[PDB]
Design a protein around this ligand. Sequence first.
Ligand SMILES: O=C(O)CNC(=O)c1cccc2c1OCO2
Ligand SMILES: O=C(O)CNC(=O)c1cccc2c1OCO2
Lengths: 149, 149
Amino acid sequence: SPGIWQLDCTHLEGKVILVAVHVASGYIEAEVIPAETGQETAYFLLKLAGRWPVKTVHTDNGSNFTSTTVKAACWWAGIKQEDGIPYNPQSQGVIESMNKELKKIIGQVRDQAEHLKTAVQMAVFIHNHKRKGYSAGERIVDIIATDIQ
Amino acid sequence: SPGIWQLDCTHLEGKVILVAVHVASGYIEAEVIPAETGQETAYFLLKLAGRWPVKTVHTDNGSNFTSTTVKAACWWAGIKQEDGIPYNPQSQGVIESMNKELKKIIGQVRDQAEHLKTAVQMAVFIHNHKRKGYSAGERIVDIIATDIQ
Ligand SMILES: O=C(O)CNC(=O)c1cccc2c1OCO2
Ligand SMILES: O=C(O)CNC(=O)c1cccc2c1OCO2
């Protein structure tokens, strides 16, 4: 479905990378944060929903599902907050693979960037433009445009 | 035209708000930054281009046009860096009006947000969802989807 996103939190070095995946397309947005708190997650969701039509978010863990600050942001931005339980078991594997791919790209750009946050945004760029042949960026626009029409 | 963005820097309180406008649609992304440096602008452009197909950027001033760090980010992300001279004089007025609208929304949400950065992202959300009747968010997706097809 065009409005469904999944939250994904992965760790690298001693730092936290928060990722939102548009499920139907594989398109992502991502940020480096000092730690995964309710407040950080809330702010990330607010940014995402202002930029794409976020209808449903599958949260990455129970703490963010429970967080009153995350719930407030979801209320504010008109997002249905749901769990991220992989009722289809292949969901876990897809997310795992993406985290590996992302860390691999981060490794490939580390001669070019002084800070992790730059490397992560380089990885977002490369991931979203990668032709698999359409790109994830092409797919999300097509999916949403078709829905509007 | 589907790939053309314009940078816009506005000030509020004693802080700096950096805005990118998708010219054809009026869709925006925005960030609060401590000061408008080449490095801050470069990083903002990298984020933007990883998220939307940014072909051309009209920079907001001569310092960012000249900045080697901004030029490096534009090279990295495949962006043609151009000036932002309003050869069509109605360009200035449109940007001015948007800055006013954005500050107005920021004012309207200030009871809800402790930090300016939250208020700015609330303003991004409201601006992009506002029906004028299609929204800016609807228009950018339609424009880009039509271009891909
Ligand atoms: O991916 C490509 O080659 C072309 N890009 C796009 O059409 C695109 C569309 C939406 C979002 C994006 C995009 O790219 C990055 O984030
Ligand atoms: O704007 C609305 O009412 C519906 N939203 C959209 O189709 C939309 C599409 C793309 C980007 C967006 C969007 O919204 C915010 O950033």
